[PDB]
Amino acid sequence: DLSYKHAILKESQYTIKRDVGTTTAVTPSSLQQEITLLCGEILYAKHADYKYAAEIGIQYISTALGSERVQQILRNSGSEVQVVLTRTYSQMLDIHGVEKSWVEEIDKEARKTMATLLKESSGNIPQNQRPSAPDTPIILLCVGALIFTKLASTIEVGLETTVRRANRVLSDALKRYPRMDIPKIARSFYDLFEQKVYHRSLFIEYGKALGSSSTGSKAESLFVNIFMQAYGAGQTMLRWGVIARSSNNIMLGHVSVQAELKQVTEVYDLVREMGPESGLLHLRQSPKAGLLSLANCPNFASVVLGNASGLGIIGMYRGRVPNTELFSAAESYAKSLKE
Amino acid sequence: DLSYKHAILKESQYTIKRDVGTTTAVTPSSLQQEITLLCGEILYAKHADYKYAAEIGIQYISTALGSERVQQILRNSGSEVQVVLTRTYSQMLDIHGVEKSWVEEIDKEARKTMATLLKESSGNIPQNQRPSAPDTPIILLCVGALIFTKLASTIEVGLETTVRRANRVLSDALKRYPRMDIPKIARSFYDLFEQKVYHRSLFIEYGKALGSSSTGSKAESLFVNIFMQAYGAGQTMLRWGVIARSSNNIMLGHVSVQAELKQVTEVYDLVREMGPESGLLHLRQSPKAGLLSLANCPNFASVVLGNASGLGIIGMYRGRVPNTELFSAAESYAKSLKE
Amino acid sequence: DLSYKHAILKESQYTIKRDVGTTTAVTPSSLQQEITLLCGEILYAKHADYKYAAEIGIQYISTALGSERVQQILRNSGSEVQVVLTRTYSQMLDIHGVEKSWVEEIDKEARKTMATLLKESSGNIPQNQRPSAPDTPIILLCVGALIFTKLASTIEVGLETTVRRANRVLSDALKRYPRMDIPKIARSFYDLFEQKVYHRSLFIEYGKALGSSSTGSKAESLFVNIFMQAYGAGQTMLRWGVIARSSNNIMLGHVSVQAELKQVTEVYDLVREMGPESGLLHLRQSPKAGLLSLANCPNFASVVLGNASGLGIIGMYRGRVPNTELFSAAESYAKSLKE
Amino acid sequence: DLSYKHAILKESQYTIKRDVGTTTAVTPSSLQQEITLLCGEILYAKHADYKYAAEIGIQYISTALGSERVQQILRNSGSEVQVVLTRTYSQMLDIHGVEKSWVEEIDKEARKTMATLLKESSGNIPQNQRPSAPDTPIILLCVGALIFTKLASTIEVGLETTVRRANRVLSDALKRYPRMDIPKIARSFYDLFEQKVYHRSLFIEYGKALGSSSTGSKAESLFVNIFMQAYGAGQTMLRWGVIARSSNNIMLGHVSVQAELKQVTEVYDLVREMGPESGLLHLRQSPKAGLLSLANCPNFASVVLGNASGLGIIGMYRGRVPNTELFSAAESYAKSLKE
RNA sequence: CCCCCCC
RNA sequence: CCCCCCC
RNA sequence: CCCCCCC
RNA sequence: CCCCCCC
RNA sequence: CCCCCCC
């Protein structure tokens, strides 16, 4: 059945159309040196409103890939959003859907903070501490990638995890910019990813275009590391299933587990059939996701969760254990094997 | 998963573009006999500023490979830096991005030192002690290759190791040039490698074009020896893992180590899949590096570090030991086997 | 039937008469050295109005072919437009149908830009950067030829494609003239081609008189390359049909495809019967075009479009697929053969 | 389509007219014994200005073919240049477009060098070392033919290749004339070929009139060897395509390659249709060149370039690889077959 | 009615 | 637009 | 550039 | 319905 | 996030 369902979904002669009357903003590569400034003036000043930081990160992505490539990416993502270009005025940027009041506020706040830290201090600002640093857009996109790995999770868990992991992953940027509010920027990125779902596809295309590069700075290598940490998002049950098989859990040989193993292997075969893009299904909110669910094998899922709980892997996972006896037996065996 | 991640990174139909508006300097082979002089006038005099010694070494590399081949190397490294040629003036060199004041200072300092060592002494300067010696550019590039092997490490460790190893590796050059400041030249080379990342690719191409040569002087053989000592940079955990497997450590048979051995072998298979260029991934700061990390196998890494500590190989390695009990048990077994 | 229709259209003893009371402008060869200046003063300055750039390109064509040959070309194109010669005044040109205010504005804007770029800069303007360069009329006609290849398409697609292709085809001219507005010049050329349809015949005659030349500059070779890229305009279905036959698509052997293959071969026989001038039928808007339509073979057209979609050739083609089942089957087989 | 494009270009009832008000210089055969002297006084002396050496070689060509035949050659090349004859004065030559100051400078420099090498030396100048040697014009035309083979390439590559190949091809002349500056003479010939394009036709006519001769010296045989090495200039992709077909590359059987093979064979059929003069199309800058481009078959071109790269033939070819996956696969297969 | 991609 | 290696 | 042995 | 830990 | 010793 599962192969037939995927065959129906894949073999479609008709293309969906959505967001027909909508538009979005991009910034041409000719403005990259400008957007960098903006992407850094968000980082070293303490701003009251961090509402469009995610849009500025996506603007930098658009400068990197190019306006035409970004339009093509949005078009092939199933969304008929018409790209609107970015202009300059007196210079500053007039990004579509980003209020000019916001851009002026961010610029003025950063200029005032820079003046205050230059007047009082000894005037020895290093090359990495200024807003026009060239890795500041990647530093903002690193907060974006941290909150990207938690798009399958909830908002509160995502924000808490982003802040916790960014105090260590982004320690160097925090030292360079003492006053960068990872919570508010992470909230902005979560809002962008939820509202504009095609920007998940744009962000993934940037991740690919960055990982495929021949050279990169440490900021881009960090961004790619986090982006790849997001790969199996929304499918931790499959990873824990292969973990359970590697652990040689005895309760995998139970009668009901052996009964469901056929369709479990069917799900894994479907994973292989989709191939490399299967991992990005839940990150993209591809409607095709959910063909990879193991919820139709309650006993296998309970055994997998029990094995994970025994090994300590389960952590604070919020999934359901359908069959509690199998869960407890698997947990006991996994603890025994671990000890 | 790891094979799929590498498949995504490798199978990219789009090329990255960076350093679009930037330029760099090369020196044509027709100026090699001139750059040699410069590359040696850095070595036998005591200079206040050693800021661009690395750029002069890279200039000699550009003379060796050729301007067009160097432009091609920079282009295929993912960087759209426009090569700027080198000219002469009254003769001395006007290298782009190298201030003419610096070149004049180095030349004048070397001429004054030569006059002082000729007026006072008996006038018996041998053929190897003069700045126009033909192995002086390779002697400078040897300090560069020593600091090249420490690009994955930190700056202070790199400089300390460079000086310590250069007092023995480069003893003959030090005898020939009593006043050559390995610390400042090493600092210059570290600065060049950090700022201009495409010059890592140029330096690797010189290493290949030198190792592939049919003949070479002892300086070039030394440079190739050091360059090959840099091969596995940034991946000492994989080397220590194969060391642990060769040592037949009993704690490799632990439950958790045997649990993680599958994905460990996956990392090694990915190493084989990339092939010869895998070793140069961290040296080049290829963003694709980090697919070879064993950080997702904490128990295997702890066992490997314990085995290394028992054998005395660990030295002063600064990696983390995740599971301390496995580390201590492996260290005890490794010491027992060593004794 | 199709041969009979073409026989009726071809065997006509009566000549049509149109544009009887209309006139058009030409420029004699004696003014070529003057028109060149104008054709280049459009290219290196930033003009508010680019309305008659196409007429200036056509004026240069008229200088190249000659006034009498141009009148003959207009007469044999089915249009009874009376040629009006070009005069000079105080020197500048008074082209018929081109307001003297426009010519004065273009000349003054170019002179002011030249004065600004000479006063501020170091006064080292090369021979190719000045308006009086002899390939500037061909550079303008290259934008005209780019928008010529998109006369069967729509206006927006034509302009987008012209700009995209001119950033690469005309990179050297863009470097020579940093401020040349390919969008506005392309709009002017599209307007000319739509309003004055006999100028399509003039432009084709220039393409022939240029391709037949024994020698030419790189600009003229580029113009001929683009002009020949326009050859099969308006008939991509025939090209994709021969592509499908070359691909040996199995769905070509379907019952309905084999039913329609007879009249399909009739269309191809008509193509051969018309011969070399068949390709220029849609470019010229020859009313005889439409005898080459494959719209009366819906199943063959659907199979051809499916084959193109499978091979990736279809791109973003906007034609209709009549029979969706054949389209999908052909697409599946074409993808299978491609893989 | 390609056959129709060539049919349009070939079937033209109108002849182009260019260079109407221009003139050029020829030298009658009655002055050959004089021009020989000049053509050799360029070779054994060290001249500050080598500006018109190419014009002197072309003058010798004009003496060889004859003034009337040279005028006819210029006329049938599509250029309406009026031949101006050459006169003598007190003897020396007054060549049109060649300043008499230049001729006097060359003659005086050669006479002074001859006096210096006769006064100091033992006075045993052999018959081949004097300027009046009868193969000196052919020795100059050999540098001209070396730079002729690189007219499709760039200026810097052409000059570098000319010098590199002339140190070996023209070793005997270099021994006879120690001070002959192949770089400056090659620059002069490149300038002539770029400025006066009809002189490419004259130079080709000399190549034909020399190859058709019943007897010749070793200089003329060398000139014909180089001239024939120039035959396929500007079309190395076709030669590499037939090389790939000879290599039986498996990736030629790919789906897209087999898709494009039809129009590829169309290009080759057009090559056969034009016949012997097809090779000289790019050398002559015939505007008809570009009908032979394989740029409209990106997958075939990528496979051909990959095969060449595998066999080591690609060298340092600067063409584009459109489809990188096909290029890499073809390169791998070609290396495997080579090994 | 016809046309509609890429180069 | 085209061209781009070696001999 | 080409040629290059033996009979 | 699906998802849900850690890095 | 990754890296981190010695030669």
Q: How many CB pairs lie under 8 A apart between chains A and C?
A: 6
Inter-chain residue contact D197 with C215, CB threshold 8 Å: yes
Give residues with Cβ within 8 angstroms of B4, minimum separation 6: A231, A275, A276, A279
The tokens for D55 are 């014009």
CA pair distance A126, C275, nearest whole angstrom? 72
The answer to whether C194 touches C150, Cβ cutoff 8 Å, is no
CA pair distance C97, C83, nearest whole angstrom? 11
The answer to whether A34 touches A93, Cβ cutoff 8 Å, is yes
A266 sits in the region (left: phi over 0; alpha: psi -120 to 50; else beta) called alpha
Give residues with Cβ within 8 angstroms of D199, minimum separation 6: D58, D192, D193
Q: Cβ–Cβ contacts within 10 Å for residue A306, how many? A: 28
b/e map C187-197, b = 16+ CB within 10 Å: bbbbbbbeebb
The tokens for A267 are 């799900």
- Residues from chain D contacting residue B13 (CB–CB below 8 Å): 324
The tokens for A71 are 């339009």
- Residues from chain D contacting residue C33 (CB–CB below 8 Å): none
User: How many angstroms away from the CA of D275 is the closest CA of chain C?
Assistant: 16
Three-state DSSP class for D87? strand
Give residues with Cβ within 8 angstroms of A25, minimum separation 6: A55, A59, A83, A84, A85, A86, A95, A96, A97, A98
Tokens 């292709």 belong to C165
CA pair distance D63, D58, nearest whole angstrom? 9
Closest alpha carbon within chain D to C227: D5
Inter-chain residue contact A217 with B201, CB threshold 8 Å: no
Question: What is the resolution in angstroms?
Answer: 4.7
Inter-chain residue contact D14 with C215, CB threshold 8 Å: no
Residue A319 approaches strand H within 7 Å at CB: yes
The answer to whether A133 touches A39, Cβ cutoff 8 Å, is no
Residues 198-217/C with CB within 7 Å of nucleic chain E are none
The answer to whether B295 touches B214, Cβ cutoff 8 Å, is no
The answer to whether D135 touches D43, Cβ cutoff 8 Å, is no
CA pair distance C171, D339, nearest whole angstrom? 41
b/e map B298-334, b = 16+ CB within 10 Å: bbbbbbbbbbbbbbebbeeeebebebeebbbbbbebb
The answer to whether C63 touches C73, Cβ cutoff 8 Å, is no
Of D150, D148, D138, the C-alpha closest to D57 is D138
Q: Cβ–Cβ contacts within 10 Å for residue D269, how many? A: 12
Three-state DSSP class for A150? coil
The tokens for C191 are 């307007």
HSE of B29, CA atoms in CB hemisphere, 13 A? 8
Residue D230 approaches strand G within 7 Å at CB: no
- Residues from chain C contacting residue A68 (CB–CB below 8 Å): 164
Burial of A167 (0-12, 13-18, 19+ CB in 10 A): exposed
Inter-chain residue contact C216 with D287, CB threshold 8 Å: yes
Question: Please, what's the largest Cα pairwise distance for chain B?
Answer: 75
Q: What is the DSSP code (8-state) at residue B214?
A: S
CA of C339 to C1' of E6 (A): 20
Inter-axis angle of helices D136-148 and D32-41, nearest 10: 70
Closest alpha carbon within chain A to B3: A276
CA pair distance D188, D182, nearest whole angstrom? 10
CA of D225 to C1' of F7 (A): 10
Of C310, C230, C299, C289, the C-alpha closest to C264 is C299
Tokens 């200046």 belong to C37
Residue C290 approaches strand E within 7 Å at CB: yes
Residue A182 approaches strand I within 7 Å at CB: no
Q: Cβ–Cβ contacts within 10 Å for residue B31, how many? A: 23
SS (H, E, C) chain C: CHHHHHHHHHCCCCCCCCCCCCEEECCCHHHHHHHHHHHHHCCCCCCCCCCCHHHHHHHHHHHHHCHHHHHHHHHHCCCCCEEECCEEECCEEECCCCCHHHHHHHHHHHHHHHHHHHHCCCCCCCCCCCCCCCCHHHHHHHHHHHHHCCCCCCHHHHHHHHHHHHHHHCHHHHHHCCCCCHHHHHHHHHHHHHHCCHHHHHHHHHHHHHHCCCCCCHHHHHHHHHHHHCCCCCCHHHHHHHHHHHHCCHHHHCHHHHHHHHHHHHHHHHHHHHHHHHCCCCCCCCCCCCCCCCCCCHHHHHHHHHHHHHHCCCCCCCCCCCCHHHHHHHHHHHHHHHC
Inter-axis angle of helices D53-65 and D67-76, nearest 10: 110
Pairing mode, strands B23-25 and B82-84 = parallel
Burial of C161 (0-12, 13-18, 19+ CB in 10 A): middle
In B63-130, the DSSP E strands lie at 82-84, 87-89, 92-94
Give residues with Cβ within 8 angstroms of A21, minimum separation 6: none
Tell which strand F nucleotides have any atom below 7 Å from a protein Cβ. 1-7
Q: What is the DSSP code (8-state) at residue D214?
A: S
